[PDB]
């Protein structure tokens, strides 16, 4: 059974909120919870951060929140820190199904000297550590929401959505999939195919795995889920197993879906994209197709959605 959500008036707007709060006057939100998403063998920490915005900073799935960490801009004395953007990992109703909270999926950026391995905290990422170090009741300066690239196309409730994530790039897809499958949204009844491909370092680095596995058992004809574990698996050519290698295992199914009008999404660190492009080119070549021409048509048809960072 789908989970009741409120308030239904969040469905009424016909345009997404944008820049409701700006950097000079952010919204002072409050941390609800911070929890690690990863096991002890993960190379670094990734946390789920729940933020109470009280309904003052609503958003649509696929958008980002800005966070202004405290302190001074190290490059402009007297000025605030620059905004850092984070893909919202929750639906518009949020993890408490009430329209009052939104969630972030935040990897700690930690610096290690390339030769000695010595950590240097002064070179760690300011906003990501600020967020992962936060505790219930702490205040967060929120801006936005912002972004339109990753809004979910809902005009066809039976569309196909192929979602390609590495690491924290899973965030918008957690939101899409909760709206598609878990929440009782009477004006969006999804009857298409949602297919999540996720690449992470190892099993302990998986994010939200139990939630996604649950969708396989509840919606076996509408959801597919495939994972690539780069430090624990090898591809067919002998390289470390990346998300593009999982795509290749389903070369024919995914190309057929794209030809049929499927939307395809990419999110996570930008270093994910070169290997993906290389694989898609090789898959097309084996089929006797030009990947350049196919990608041009996907962009012209508004099927191609990329937000990497
Ligand atoms: C649209 C969008 C969505 C995003 N979504 C997410 C998301 O869902 N989750 C997420 O985790 N991130 C996400 N990001 C990235 C996020 O915005 C930040 O860039 C990231 O968290 C790092 O910010 P920071 O403040 O921690 O690091 P910063 O302080 O900005 O530092 C940047 C990097 O430089 C390194 N560094 C600092 N000083 C030195 C030095 N002297 N020498 C060498 N290295 C140094 C830091 O360790 C860090 O890796 C997103 C970005 C965009 C644009």
Residue numbers in the entry: 1009 to 1317
Task: Cite, word for word, the article reporting this structure.
FNR is a flavoenzyme that contains a noncovalently bound flavin adenine dinucleotide (FAD) as a prosthetic group. It catalyzes redox reactions between Fd and NAD(P)H. The redox-active component is the isoalloxazine ring of FAD, which undergoes transitions among three states: fully oxidized (FAD), semiquinone (; partially reduced) and hydroquinone (FADH2; fully reduced). In root plastids, which lack PS I, R-FNR reduces nonphotosynthetic Fd by oxidizing NADPH from the oxidative pentose phosphate pathway.
The structure of R115A mutant FNR (mtFNR) was also determined in the oxidized form (mtFNRoxi) to examine the arrangement of water molecules around the FAD moiety. Although the space group of the mtFNRoxi crystals differed (P3121), the main-chain structure of mtFNRoxi was highly similar to those of wtFNRoxi and wtFNRred. Focusing on the water molecules surrounding FAD, the arrangement in the mtFNRoxi structure closely resembled that in wtFNRred. The R115A mutant (mtFNR) mimicked the dis­ordered side chain of wtFNRred, with its X-ray structure confirming that the water-molecule positions in mtFNRoxi resemble those in wtFNRred.
